[model samples]
Target chain A: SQIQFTRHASDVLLNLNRLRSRDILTDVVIVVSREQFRAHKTVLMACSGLFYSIFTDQLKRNLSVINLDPEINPEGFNILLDFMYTSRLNLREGNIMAVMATAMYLQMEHVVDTCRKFIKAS
Target chain B: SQIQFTRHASDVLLNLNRLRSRDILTDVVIVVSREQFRAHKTVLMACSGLFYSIFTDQLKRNLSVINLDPEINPEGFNILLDFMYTSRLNLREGNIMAVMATAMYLQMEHVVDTCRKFIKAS
Candidate 1:
């Protein structure tokens, strides 16, 4: 949508598949979808254990959390950061959701519209 | 709320001060938290450039993203994979906010609520 270029849905599908093959994501890490992540104890242990172990000295240090996976390449990791900073990632519904959640959570509502517009597009 | 241990706010602060000295989060990458992250342009260029370069074979594949900083160890990378596997990075807000945004954009919603709760706690 941003580019103004258009293509058939079918063509897009094929391209997605092709992209998967080239190891194009050499830097990217594929993660389990959300529902899949919550059920595991190992994930919970790692997240809480890691966080406390990592940042325990901070505050009440009562950082109680559940299971989580933290897979990300520097690029993807940075995307989370960019969104955290600018809130501009909301060009599409999928991305909008991410920015809104972050803005709302971080108490930075400046980018909520970025969240709204992207979802509207979808 | 999850843990039974309780401590005074000042006590917690003292404890937190203790952590700043230790390298507990050697695994986590510190970035320009939210507001600071947006004003920069290098980050924008890197993100999209990397996304398209990596995922173009998929879909019409012109994924235009922006600047990204993909730095991680095998352990940190696996954390992202874990979130992709399950939506439950339910353990902490700061930890899971990244998970939620990435999940939401990646279209993994089931975990959004879970991540939100974590943020609320913090």
Candidate 2:
């Protein structure tokens, strides 16, 4: 008669994302200039190496808040981070390089030429 | 050429769970008796009321490692925690009461008579 969780899911990502959507269990707040996204570290690490390095390799395994504006494109980085949690990676061929540069600056090699081909593959 | 991810998925939960599978982004460690499962607070809070209380009630939103062994059946707790991340909750009617009591102690009311009917649903 104590625990008070709200009603919820069976689909794992749906559950995870839903929690994210509501800012429920998100341990990290990603700041990019004035934009911020609440997220889980595991997703960041799973998708990008930069996040792994910052969160793990001796700094703040205790990281709850982090910002990426030192040498970056917040919008592009935003897309890259956005790319991590969803099925779609949003970018057009025109500004694709900007996103990759953001990833390149952040150290995410997961963004590849194949993704480039989506815009250029035509 | 800096970020160093190992390689992975598109399904959000699949990605989240896989990260969990490798202990990649799991922010919390749950210990019951001698068993330990790495998990995310988002998943825990989404599934149980007890977690909601402990994580947010002003003690340790900084919670990185937590142990639940004070007043409970570790085995039942394990199953309940297991229930949060997977498609199944393992228990027969004979021990259903045990899981619910575990939830009760933990403050999880999500467990209801319908779940119990799985064993008695004739």
Candidate 3:
């Protein structure tokens, strides 16, 4: 009556990120400083409280171009984007704290919570 | 350089579908058999080639409500969408073949292929 494919999620994420890389099906443009990050708004809304509010709030009206916090580290934004689409957190030397900061700013509770556990494990 | 959290995908999928039930962050409307299903276009594009082609063809121009094939069974389309967003096949009595046909029509190779493997296991 019920069957679940474990590998299917990995496959779905693979193509989701692939489509994102090509800017395919991406409806929102995230502007951070001089860089514009293209992504599906649903993915962002699914992950971040800030984005969830923007999309949910009626006043935002056809909001396609989003101007992100100026202080967020550019590298950290990309790190968060990767996690948003791939469900994997990629942490490198010297940028761990920086990436965590971005997660906190986004109010991505699950993502931030995972980072704490990962922090202890790391 | 990398710390992977295995559970992140479920968190992402949970909110995506929750958003769907509330009609939040859904960018596309799929009309089938007098029913309108709201979903994110990115997820559809990630799962189906026909959707990939539609979003890719620039001439369609800001497409939102997609009128799917009139003859396709509506229940099967919902089954396919559940698989698309949840990565699980919700099969019931007498609907297996119908669902597979919708998957085939969508040109969802991974989905169709996965169904074959699941079939052998079932």
Question: What is the CAPRI rating of model 2's predicted complex?
Answer: incorrect
Per-structure clash totals for the candidates: 46, 7, 0
**Models ranked on DockQ:** 3, 2, 1
State which candidate has the highest DockQ: 3
Cα lDDT of model 1 by residue, A20-90, tens digit: 34433222232323322111111111222333442344542333332224432233223333332222232
Worst 10 residues of 1 chain B by lDDT: B35-44
lDDT at residue A6 of model 1 (Cα atoms): 24
Q: After superposing candidate 2 on the true structure, give the runs of residues whose Cα lies further than 4 Å from its correct spot.
A: A1-38, A63-71, A86-88, A101-114, B1-39, B59-72, B92-97, B100-114
Residues B9-103 of candidate 2: C-alpha lDDT, one tens digit per residue = 33334455566776765778877766777887776775677786667757777777777757677778877776665534677656677786787
Best by TM-score: 3
Cα lDDT of model 2 by residue, A33-113, tens digit: 757778887667656767767776656767788878665656777677656654346777555777877877666665765
DockQ of 2: 0.22
Please give the ranking of all candidate structures by lDDT, highest first, separated by commas: 3, 2, 1
Per-residue error (Å), model 2, residue A82: 2.9
